[PDB]
Homo-oligomer: A and B are copies of this chain.
Amino acid sequence: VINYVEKAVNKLTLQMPYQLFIGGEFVDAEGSKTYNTINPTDGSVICQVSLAQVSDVDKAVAAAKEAFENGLWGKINARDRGRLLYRLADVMEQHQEELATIEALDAGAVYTLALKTHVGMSIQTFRYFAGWCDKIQGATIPINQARPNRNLTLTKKEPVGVCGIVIPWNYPLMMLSWKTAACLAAGNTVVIKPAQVTPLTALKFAELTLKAGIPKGVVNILPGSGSLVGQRLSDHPDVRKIGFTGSTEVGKHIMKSCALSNVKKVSLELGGKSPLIIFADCDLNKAVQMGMSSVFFNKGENCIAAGRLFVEESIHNQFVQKVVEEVEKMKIGNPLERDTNHGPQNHEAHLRKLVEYCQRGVKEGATLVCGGNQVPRPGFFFQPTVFTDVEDHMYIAKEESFGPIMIISRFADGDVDAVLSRANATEFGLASGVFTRDINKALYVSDKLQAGTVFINTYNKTDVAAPFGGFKQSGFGKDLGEAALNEYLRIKTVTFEY
């Protein structure tokens, strides 16, 4: 029997595993060490969670290695691997309300949104990649023939082997799902390290892999610290690939660690300062709706959030007025209240960073139009914030807040290349967007934006089939889409002479 933290909430009885998941079983960490996970709605302790030690990382990797090399996962047909991943998606769907509730509790995700996105997209991710398993194909290649003999050259796509994945805290289940689905679809086994502050949906997911009949050791989950657990994963001689999403400084470190151990493969998604360019010829009311969403979606805790809005001179003031009108209509509160628009920030230290980010924005001369502070109420709520008169040299024009902070600059009527230059003048390159009714501007601007994703007349429109990843210091490699699979496969060339 699995030990649960039990909690009657949201019309449900949540049953929440809290231990490490190694070789298909939930087990205490070395020395039964634990830590507290904190509810951001009221600052309370949800429960104690096992705190993985180095010896636990080694056990997880050994279980993953054994599962890949000798266990069933390495022997079944691609098609049957596919069936298991579909079945996993089904099981996640059967538990979707419970998962969304756990996410509401652990990450402060608004319940209605956690259902549709955090959980709904996770389900879609597994179903999408499940369909790839038997459609991953190599090549036959018309090489020059060693006359009078003949040659056949083919490629085989093969799994990389044991993978480590390090997840951030903003969408705990969904980031896990993005990377894990592609990893498992390609035939690998995995050790997953969730963000220390958000372990609960990952551990509930682990239990769901058991219900789905995923062979023991294919998935291992180790709550605990990046600098202990994540570090050992990057150093481990039996791990052949790291998939990472998080900050630029940690991504750099992780890549360095992959280098110094055994040149394991690495993919990096490192956040952004993504620009949204709104032209005077756009649909204005839509621009306001999508611009708001571009910033405030999931309380700003969103890798692709627009970190700067460039609004054409002649519509700037009307744009700002409408935004203020819309912001005042936002309902802030408990993520379980069904009319909540804006939930709390993920954890305390992030709230403090947002407070300091906004103090700095004011200090350096930007105009604070709304917000900029903690909402007085228990937990870690931050006021939806609007800054105008933001200039290109300012800190808040360069640094990613990862909070609900709209950062607006004007640009000159009928200038296009000039605004592009300012939009591209970051070392980040994750996402971007443009609002305009003009086909020629939209196409030209999408060509010129230096960003892995460009939205046109929409924002936050990700899709499990559409590859997502950064340029420049936003990193490299894709999650989602066919392209994600290539991070998790190797190519063997086989050349016959006959």
A: which residues have CB within 8 A of B? 77-80, 82-83, 86, 124, 127-128, 130-146, 150-157, 240, 248, 251-256, 258-260, 262-263, 265, 268, 270, 427, 436-440, 442-444, 446-447, 451-458, 461, 463-469, 471-473, 475-476, 478, 481-483, 486, 490-498
Q: Which residues of B contact A463 (CB under 8 A)?
A: 141, 143-144, 151, 153, 495
Q: Are A144 and B79 in contact (CB under 8 A)?
A: yes
Q: Are B268 and A495 in contact (CB under 8 A)?
A: no
Number of copies: 4
Q: Choose from B77, B252, B476 the contact partner of A260 (Cβ within 8 Å).
A: B252
Q: Are B128 and A140 in contact (CB under 8 A)?
A: no
Q: Choose from B79, B252, B254, B465 the contact partner of A135 (Cβ within 8 Å).
A: B465
Q: Which residues of B contact A134 (CB under 8 A)?
A: 128, 131, 142-143, 464-465
Q: Choose from B82, B240, B492, B496 the contact partner of A472 (Cβ within 8 Å).
A: B240
Q: Are A263 and B259 in contact (CB under 8 A)?
A: no
Q: Which residues of B contact A262 (CB under 8 A)?
A: 427, 472-473
Chain B nearest CB from A243 CB (Å) reads 14
Q: Which residues of B contact A457 (CB under 8 A)?
A: 439-440, 496-498
* A interface secondary structure, majority: mixed
* Given A134-B142, A492-B452, CB of A151 within 8 Å of CB of B461: yes
Q: Report how far A144 CA is from B153 CA in the complex, Å.
A: 22
Contact sample, A vs B, 22 pairs, CB 8 Å cutoff? A79-B124, A82-B131, A130-B131, A131-B132, A131-B135, A133-B142, A135-B482, A137-B142, A137-B482, A150-B447, A154-B154, A255-B255, A256-B256, A256-B259, A259-B259, A263-B268, A437-B438, A453-B492, A456-B495, A456-B497, A458-B496, A467-B491
Q: Are A142 and B454 in contact (CB under 8 A)?
A: no
Chain B nearest CB from A454 CB (Å) reads 5
Nearest first, the 3 closest Cβ-Cβ pairs linking A and B are: A131-B131, A458-B497, A255-B259
Query: Of residues A133, A138, A259, A456, which shows the largest number of chain B Cβ atoms within 10 Å of its Cβ?
Result: A259
Q: Report how far A72 CA is from B140 CA in the complex, Å.
A: 23
Q: Are A252 and B248 in contact (CB under 8 A)?
A: no
Q: Report how far A132 CA is from B127 CA in the complex, Å.
A: 12
Given A128-B134, A151-B463, output 16 extra A-B contacts at Cβ < 8 Å: A80-B144, A86-B86, A132-B135, A134-B142, A136-B142, A142-B157, A143-B461, A146-B458, A155-B467, A255-B258, A255-B259, A256-B260, A263-B473, A455-B497, A457-B498, A486-B486
Q: Which residues of B contact A251 (CB under 8 A)?
A: 263
Q: Which residues of B contact A138 (CB under 8 A)?
A: 139-140
Chain B nearest CB from A152 CB (Å) reads 6
Q: Which residues of B contact A150 (CB under 8 A)?
A: 443-444, 447
Q: Which residues of B contact A137 (CB under 8 A)?
A: 139-142, 482
Q: Are B496 and A443 in contact (CB under 8 A)?
A: yes
Give A476's nearest chain B residue, CB to CB. B265
Give A281's nearest chain B residue, CB to CB. B437
Query: Of residues A142, A143, A253, A446, which shows the largest number of chain B Cβ atoms within 10 Å of its Cβ?
Result: A142
Give A497's nearest chain B residue, CB to CB. B458
Q: Report how far A490 CA is from B453 CA in the complex, Å.
A: 11
Q: Report how far A452 CA is from B79 CA in the complex, Å.
A: 24
Q: Are B454 and A144 in contact (CB under 8 A)?
A: no
Q: Which residues of B contact A461 (CB under 8 A)?
A: 143, 146, 151, 495, 497
Q: Which residues of B contact A124 (CB under 8 A)?
A: 79
Chain B nearest CB from A113 CB (Å) reads 15
Q: Which residues of B contact A130 (CB under 8 A)?
A: 131
Q: Are B142 and A78 in contact (CB under 8 A)?
A: yes
Chain B nearest CB from A109 CB (Å) reads 20
Give A153's nearest chain B residue, CB to CB. B466
* Given A154-B154, A472-B262, A475-B263, CB of A453 within 8 Å of CB of B498: no
* Given A77-B144, A156-B140, A439-B438, CB of A492 within 8 Å of CB of B454: yes
Q: Are B143 and A140 in contact (CB under 8 A)?
A: no
Give A471's nearest chain B residue, CB to CB. B490
Q: Choose from B153, B248, B442 the contact partner of A439 (Cβ within 8 Å).
A: B442
* Given A135-B135, A139-B137, A140-B137, CB of A496 within 8 Å of CB of B255: no
Q: Report how far A446 CA is from B78 CA in the complex, Å.
A: 19
Q: Report how far A83 CA is from B482 CA in the complex, Å.
A: 19
Chain B nearest CB from A312 CB (Å) reads 16
Chain B nearest CB from A247 CB (Å) reads 12
